[PDB]
Amino acid sequence: AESLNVSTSLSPDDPIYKGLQSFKKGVESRTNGEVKIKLFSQLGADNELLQHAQAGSNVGVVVDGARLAQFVPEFAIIPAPFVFKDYTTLKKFISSPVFAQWSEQMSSKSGLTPLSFNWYQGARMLVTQKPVSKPSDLNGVRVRALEAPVTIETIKCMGGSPTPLSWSEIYSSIQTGVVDAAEAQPTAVYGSKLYEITKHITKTNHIHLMTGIIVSQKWLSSLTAEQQTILREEAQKNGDIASENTILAGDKMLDEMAKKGMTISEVDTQPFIDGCRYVPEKLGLSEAYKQVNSII
């Protein structure tokens, strides 16, 4: 018998979690139970789990490019601002040979491998008290940030002032005037109940959130060829399902907030794009950015 333990951080009602459930169902069905998938809320922080996975653990985690940059630094471009014009363009890049090269490098040099990297978690948008049609509308606006260079530079390049604080504290920070605004994907805006205390969502879609199920190469290679391909086939197939469900949920959450008094607006992104073109270079990610652009 064999098994994979997936450490998760999402609510069981999230599309990504239900996708992991579909993934479990697929794998266990096709192997008649010889490979079992366990989903945990318990196992440890992502960074310590990844070290264990390097050593051969049968533990997995759903993580993004920023977390994998420590193994292959190119990965850090995926969450950078205004790299991908839309979701399908993002998919085109993830499926390309350049990305395949980065994954091969992680597998062969760092002993970690994505079963797939198409678990989409949304597009980040602006949540504000006032309308935003152009970057100068954010001058003087304090936007919640995070102690990471990409996030900080994203807020700056878009025109706001980055104000780091824990996401678990975003509602009280807005309510008490520590910060004016936030920057996040719809399920998080909705999940934190921000529609209670803000008035505008602007669809800048400035960052795309792409993740995958990352596992030990040593563990995966210890399984049979048939078990390996089932795992990889099912991860990709179910990542696509979860992705569509994320988008579906996102749209409906936005609709629900508009019906709770919020205004949701599209925006001409071109000025934001031009204002953020320096970011990859400032962050030292030019090589990665140039390889992405060779594709898209």
Side-chain angles (χ1 to χ4, degrees), residues 1-9 11-17 19-24 26-91 93-108 110-133 135-225 227-281 283-289 291-296:
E2 310 285 355
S3 69
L4 176 68
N5 301 309
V6 175
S7 173
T8 80
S9 63
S11 309
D13 55 323
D14 188 83
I16 296 299
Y17 189 90
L20 285 180
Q21 286 180 304
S22 296
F23 167 70
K24 173 196 188 33
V27 172
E28 296 186 352
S29 185
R30 292 182 63 190
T31 64
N32 311 283
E34 283 291 317
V35 178
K36 177 165 170 87
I37 305 294
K38 287 150 293 169
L39 310 188
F40 289 86
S41 52
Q42 273 306 71
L43 290 187
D46 290 343
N47 231 63
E48 54 183 319
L49 267 65
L50 292 167
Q51 297 293 278
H52 286 140
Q54 286 184 301
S57 290
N58 65 336
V59 174
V61 60
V62 177
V63 302
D64 76 328
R67 183 65 84 195
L68 304 168
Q70 64 189 285
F71 309 120
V72 167
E74 285 77 355
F75 280 120
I77 194 63
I78 296 172
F82 299 108
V83 171
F84 308 98
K85 65 182 183 294
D86 55 34
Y87 173 59
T88 63
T89 300
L90 167 70
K91 288 196 297 178
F93 177 71
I94 301 301
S95 300
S96 73
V98 166
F99 182 85
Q101 281 156 28
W102 299 356
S103 302
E104 172 67 12
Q105 183 181 332
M106 190 173 63
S107 166
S108 61
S110 301
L112 300 166
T113 187
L115 293 182
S116 78
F117 210 75
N118 65 332
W119 292 71
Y120 185 62
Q121 297 197 42
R124 301 187 83 90
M125 307 170 181
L126 294 178
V127 192
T128 62
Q129 307 295 0
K130 273 65 180 184
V132 179
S133 53
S136 69
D137 289 341
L138 284 179
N139 296 347
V141 180
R142 295 170 293 164
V143 189
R144 180 262 177 183
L146 173 150
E147 193 192 356
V150 181
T151 309
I152 290 252
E153 208 58 42
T154 288
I155 302 309
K156 290 157 82 178
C157 81
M158 296 182 64
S161 300
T163 306
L165 57 110
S166 174
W167 181 251
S168 60
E169 296 285 334
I170 189 63
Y171 191 102
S172 60
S173 297
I174 287 168
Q175 196 60 319
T176 66
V178 182
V179 80
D180 302 305
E183 169 284 301
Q185 74 272 28
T187 56
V189 178
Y190 183 82
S192 293
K193 287 186 301 173
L194 290 181
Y195 51 82
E196 291 186 354
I197 54 176
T198 57
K199 293 134 206 87
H200 290 276
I201 296 174
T202 302
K203 296 201 184 190
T204 42
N205 299 9
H206 49 275
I207 291 169
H208 291 276
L209 297 169
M210 192 62 113
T211 60
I213 301 162
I214 309 310
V215 304
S216 168
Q217 184 68 59
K218 180 182 159 196
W219 174 76
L220 179 59
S221 284
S222 65
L223 311 189
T224 60
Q227 283 164 353
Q228 292 186 44
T229 194
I230 286 163
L231 282 169
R232 291 189 170 287
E233 283 166 45
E234 297 298 316
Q236 195 183 330
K237 295 196 291 188
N238 288 285
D240 194 68
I241 293 173
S243 291
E244 297 293 357
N245 281 346
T246 284
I247 294 173
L248 256 26
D251 285 355
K252 75 155 154 67
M253 284 162 181
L254 289 171
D255 176 76
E256 283 314 293
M257 294 187 281
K259 285 351 173 199
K260 280 176 173 327
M262 289 216 71
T263 311
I264 320 308
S265 308
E266 305 295 335
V267 67
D268 177 13
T269 49
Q270 195 61 57
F272 293 95
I273 289 169
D274 301 334
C276 298
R277 60 137 279 274
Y278 80 92
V279 172
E281 181 173 319
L283 299 169
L285 307 173
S286 290
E287 186 149 324
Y289 187 68
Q291 290 166 57
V292 164
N293 287 323
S294 74
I295 303 295
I296 67 176

